[PDB]
Amino acid sequence: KCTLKSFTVEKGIYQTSNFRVQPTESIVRFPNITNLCPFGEVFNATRFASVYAWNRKRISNCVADYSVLYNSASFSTFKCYGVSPTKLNDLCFTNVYADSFVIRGDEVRQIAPGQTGKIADYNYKLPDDFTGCVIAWNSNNLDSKVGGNYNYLFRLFRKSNLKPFERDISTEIYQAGSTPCNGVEGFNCYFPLQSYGFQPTNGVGYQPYRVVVLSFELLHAPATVCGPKKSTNLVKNKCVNFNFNGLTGTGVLTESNKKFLPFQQFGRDIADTTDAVRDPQTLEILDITPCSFGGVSVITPGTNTSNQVAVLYQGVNCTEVNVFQTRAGCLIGAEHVNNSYECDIPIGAGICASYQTSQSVIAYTMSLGAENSVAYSNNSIAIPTNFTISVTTEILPVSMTKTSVDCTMYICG
C-alpha cells in the first residue's frame, strides 16, 4: 500500500523492498602483538635532527594509541592526509615511520604533500599521495639559546628539487653563476647549508618548532602496528558484523579452500570488494559472502475484494533465511494445489497463483490448454456443414499527448 501510494490496489504481484539476512553479532579480530610503541622516544626526545638531514624512525611490531597525541594540548599543528585523526585508533598498518626535524615556525606550511619553498624544495619533499599526519609545535623553551642555537642547519641551495622522500646530506659548493667553484667558496660560489641561530627573544614566526611526520604504511598487507582496540572470539558459517585489522565488513564469515601465497593478506572479487581474509591470530583463510538477499514481491488479490496476502522472497531457498519452495523463490502464505487452473497472477517457471476458497492465495502449475487428440487417418476428412460470422475487436494506440518542457524554466525557475 505504501509502495503504490494507495490503499486501493488491483489484483497482482508487486515489488516492495530488498530483504536481507541480518548480522547476528560483531566480530573484531586483530594481532595479539601486546607491547607498546616508543612515541616517548619521538615527541619527548632529548635531541632533534637538522631539517637538511631529518631522522626517520620505524614504528612497528606493537600496539599504539593516537588519542594520547590528538587529545594533547602540546601540539601547535596536527594535519592528517589519507586518514582522519579521530578515527586512528580503529586502524592497523604494516609499519609507521616518524620523520623528525626542527624548522622555524614560518616554514611549517611547507610541510604538506607536493609543496614548494626551500624546505620542500631542498630538505623534505612529501609525496603527492601522502597518507599520514604532520605534527608540529613551538620548542623555543628547549631548542632556542642565548646568543643563538646554531646546532640546526637547512639546505638553502640545490641544482634540482628533491623527489618525494629523497634526502640529501652532501656539502658540495653551489655554483650560482658561470664561475666554476672547484672546491672553494667565492663570488657566485656558496656553501649549501644555512643555520637558524634560534635566540629565545626572537618573534613567534622565527622561533624553533619541532616537527614529527607519521607516514602510515596503510597497505592491505600483514599488519604490525595497531591501535589500542580489543579482539574477540571468531565465528564461521553465520551472518555477522566484523572487522579484521581495521577492514570493516558485514557478511557470512566461512572457512575456505583458497590458498594464499605467503605475502597476501586479503583476497578480492571482480567488484574490488574483499572476499577472503587471512585471520591475524590463526593464519586460516576465511571466505566472505554478503548475507543472502532478494526482492520482496507481494502477491495480493485486489484490496477491494480481499486483504489476505502471500509473499515471494525472489529466487532464494528458505534454508538461507503456509510456505513452499519453488525455482521462483521461497513463497509464504500461499497454499499449494495439484489441479492446474488457467494462470491468474504469474510467479515464474510454470507457477501462478490466485485467491480462492477456506480462503487463501493458492499456488499451482499453470494449464497450457485443453488437450485434444486429432482423429487423423489416411482416408477420413471432415468438412463444415454450417458457419458462424464472428466480429473480433482489435485496439491500437496511435498518439500520446503532445508535451514539451522548457528546460531553462524547469531547471532554473
Partner 1 sequence: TMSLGAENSVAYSNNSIAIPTNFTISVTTEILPVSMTKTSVDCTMYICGDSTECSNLLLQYGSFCTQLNRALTGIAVEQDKNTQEVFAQVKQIYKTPPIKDFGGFNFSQILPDPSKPSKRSFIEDLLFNKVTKFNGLTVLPPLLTDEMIAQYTSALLAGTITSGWTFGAGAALQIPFAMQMAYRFNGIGVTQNVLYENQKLIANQFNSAIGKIQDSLSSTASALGKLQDVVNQNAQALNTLVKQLSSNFGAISSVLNDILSRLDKVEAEVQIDRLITGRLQSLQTYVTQQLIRAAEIRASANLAATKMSECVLGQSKRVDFCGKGYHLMSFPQSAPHGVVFLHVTYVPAQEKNFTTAPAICHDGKAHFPREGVFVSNGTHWFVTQRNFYEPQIITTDNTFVSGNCDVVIGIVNNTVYDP
Partner 2 sequence: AYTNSFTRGVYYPDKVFRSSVLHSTQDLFLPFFSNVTWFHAIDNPVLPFNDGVYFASTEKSNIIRGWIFGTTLDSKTQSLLIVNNATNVVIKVCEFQFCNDPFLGVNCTFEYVSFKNLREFVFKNIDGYFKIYSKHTPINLVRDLPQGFSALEPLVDLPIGINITRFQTLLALHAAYYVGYLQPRTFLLKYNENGTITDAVDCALDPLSETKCTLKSFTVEKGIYQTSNFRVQPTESIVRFPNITNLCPFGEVFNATRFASVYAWNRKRISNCVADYSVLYNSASFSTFKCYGVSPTKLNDLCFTNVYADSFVIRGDEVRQIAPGQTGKIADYNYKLPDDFTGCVIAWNSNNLDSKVGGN
Ligand X SMILES: *[C@@H]1O[C@H](CO)[C@@H](O)[C@H](O)[C@H]1NC(C)=O
Asked if 412 is part of the footprint of ligand X (rule: CB under 6 A), the reply reads: no
Grid cell locating 295: 526482492
Residue 289: contacted member of partner 2, ligand X, partner 1, none (CB under 5 to 8 Å, by partner type) = partner 1
Kindly state the DSSP code that residue 105 receives in the 8-state scheme.
G
Selected range binding ligand X among 86-94, 219-227, 317-325, 354-362, rule: CB under 6 A: 317-325
> β-pairing, 12-20 with 193-195?
unpaired
Least Å from the CB of residue 194 to partner 1: 35
Which residue in 119, 290, 334, 353 binds partner 1 (CB under 8 A)? 290
Residue 264 touches which of partner 2, ligand X, partner 1, none (CB < 5 to 8 A by kind)? Answer: partner 2
Q: How far apart are CA 281 and CA 30, in angstroms?
A: 7
Find the binding residues for partner 1 in span 71-130 (CB under 8 A): 82-84, 86-87, 90-91
- DSSP secondary structure letter of residue 339: S
Closest CA to 29 of 292, 283, 291, 290: 283
- 329: enclosing H helix or E strand: strand 329-332
What's the N-to-C CA distance of the chain in angstroms?
Answer: 34
- Contact window for partner 1 (CB under 8 A) among 47-55, 68-76, 154-162, 394-402: 394-402
In the list 46, 141, 237, 401, the residue contacting partner 1 (rule: CB under 8 A) is 401
* DSSP secondary structure string for all residues of 13-66: EEEEEEEEPPP-SEEEE-----SB--GGGTTS-S---BGGGPEEEEE-SEE--T
Q: How many CA atoms, within 13 angstroms, populate the side-chain half-sphere of residue 37?
A: 27
Instruction: Report, in Å, the least distance between residue 113 CB and partner 1.
Output: 13
Torsion-angle region of 178 (φ positive above 0: left; ψ -120 to 50: alpha; else: beta): alpha
Site for partner 2 in 158-217 (CB under 8 A): 163, 165-170, 172, 205
236 makes contact, choosing from partner 2, partner 1, ligand X, none, with CB < 5 to 8 Å by partner type, with none
260 binds partner 2 (CB under 8 A): yes
**Shortest Cβ 29–partner 1 spacing (Å):** 14
Q: Which is nearer to ligand X, 241 or 303 (CB)?
A: 303
Name which of residues 158 to 217 contact ligand X (CB under 6 A). 169
Please tell me whether residue 88 adopts helix, strand or coil conformation.
helix
Catalog residues that contact ligand X under the rule CB under 6 A.
32, 53, 169, 281, 304-305, 317, 319, 325, 336, 338, 375, 378-379, 382
